[PDB]
Design a protein around this ligand. Structure first.
Ligand SMILES: [Zn+2]
Ligand SMILES: [Zn+2]
Ligand SMILES: [Zn+2]
Ligand SMILES: [Zn+2]
Lengths: 188, 201, 202, 204
């Protein structure tokens, strides 16, 4: 009976800051869904630490990966395997976020280090994590910085072709999780 | 990375007619109005927090001092807690409750968790047949002085009908009293917490 | 060879006078200066579960009946002689008590009285007392115009002596948390300068 | 969980091939770069005497003794939890471990411990500087004559610029000189610390 988790992945070259992207997005929707974030390690088979957190992030997806993923983004009741048998909890996460190098991905997006923050083609993290000094307040973040507002990095949808900021991308994922929850409500 | 202040914990012991539920619930609607929240009550022998929307107070009843108590240790803590839900459309909410009140009638590392270990005691004028004369105890109070955590007073508020007695010290408190005692140990840990955060961070 | 005797502080106070926060500020400050952490014993300390040789130890509500246990423990902690605390866990049995500071508060022969390098009464300043209770809310407000504290990054009335002070039960002189906290560190350092030199000489 | 995981380097090599020389070179340059000192643990170490929260710690011959002593300490250090190391001198006990770099050499083949090596590398002596299979130290310490300035050392020698020894990342198989991998390690630590400060601020 469970609903299908909204899903995002982020293709990137290694120095472009896609780990900090997903994590910023995860922590934000988490803050809003009064939940927490579960990280899967790369190449992971067990869910030591899962406790039905509202959002999980999958560092460096992809192949058991493309399998254990498709159990996660499904309507089937699914039971993750454990390390300590201390087993049994359903997987209920309403969001899955992940990174790498087809309809289960409501948000298929490539990244772009903006040029004033490129450093040899790589994201200049020291500069990209300085706080923004002339910005409107973000929609899902307390405060603004260049990773949130689109200065340092942006997400390009392949299909849409459009470019959004992180702040925009989180507003978008929320809404789709709500739609899905809103219909999943009325029916029931 | 521990991030939440452990909640202040009250446990009232007592024989089953003694008002022991009525006390845990009088205190809780008092605190809740003070911090402008709501209450959320757990069933006896409970496993699921369905309907827990991070309201400020949690009531446990019939705590068996133990499934009752394994789950109790996890609420009263600093470490993040994720209540199990039966509904899938809810599972995922973080436990951020400040108070847990529990009642009972009935190993030192768990004891410290009981910030207030009281014994409910029914005063004789309000005890017909050996149990709370609830019709008496609820009648409003005529010349009582204004309570601290209630806008009006009655013989449960003011210790006329019902009083609870610290198991360890042995002194007696009314309901209206032990509320601020609890409100304040919660205000206490808040202000000390912020204070230290600001001096060493 | 042997361990130096932990410099020890005892704060006497009535219940709402803030002697726990007093001892906690002092500990955190000493521990920050010593590059350490703090370890709190629960009242009625039975076990030292979680103790990993944090240089600073806190005993909240010490009962000072010399027949009591609080004081029998206390006399092993505050001594020069190997003391291997009891752990409830046997997966934790064997670590030595090496802490250099012990900070305790209570409500109130000479061999227990030597152990207290500093024996002190806490005093609410009246401007912060709700019927002789520490008005914690306004005492934990940050100060706005204090000089930089000796041992705290920022100042507040709990630190500089606006809200609370500590009176020496002997000399009858009063001290802020900040002042007592450098006397306590100076004392441990004097013990250590002496102990370390005794070692080099032999 | 208040401290940041130290950045961690593991250099595998046979026993004459200069891996000790190479971790000490990296350590010393990282240390200058942060105005700290280095602290060296002995092989199969028990005690941390002399540890004063120097920023770079060094371990050699890790897991040489396969008993476990090496790997418990290692894992306590490459962690996010408070670690109060063991000392032989009682005077010295209780200091907190807070180094940001752990540099280890080994001769072994060692999920959640691999997670701790941010750089897992094999040392390879280039043939011109090999002598009977081991690193020719006397040749390698002669200063380079015509080399661009190195990023992390004041002058260049073949140990630095990749002439004498190289470091091959076991995963990717890419090779790096010492100077390069120093900038990489420094840059990982700064990144960790920049992301950290940002997350605190945004969820502050
Ligand atoms: Zn901005
Ligand atoms: Zn009344
Ligand atoms: Zn001040
Ligand atoms: Zn060179």
């Amino acid at each position: 009976h469970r609903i299908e988790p909204v899903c995002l992945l982020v293709h990137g070259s290694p120095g472009t800051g896609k780990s900090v992207a997903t994590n910023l997005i995860a922590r934000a929707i988490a803050e809003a869904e009064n939940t927490s974030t579960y990280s899967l390690p790369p190449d992971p088979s067990h869910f030591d630490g899962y406790k039905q957190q509202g959002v999980v992030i999958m560092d460096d997806l992809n192949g058991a990966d493309m399998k254990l993923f498709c159990q996660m983004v499904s309507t089937v009741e699914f039971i993750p395997p454990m390390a300590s048998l201390a087993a049994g909890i359903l997987f209920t996460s309403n969001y899955v976020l992940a990174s790498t190098n087809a309809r289960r991905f409501a948000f298929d997006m490539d990244i772009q280090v903006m040029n004033e923050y490129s450093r040899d083609g790589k994201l200049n993290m020291a500069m990209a994590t300085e706080m923004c000094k002339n910005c409107h307040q973000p929609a899902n973040f307390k405060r603004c910085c260049p990773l949130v507002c689109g200065k340092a990095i942006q997400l390009m949808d392949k299909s849409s072709r459009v470019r959004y900021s992180i702040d925009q991308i989180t507003t978008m994922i929320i809404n789709e999780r709500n739609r899905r929850s809103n219909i999943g409500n009325c029916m029931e």
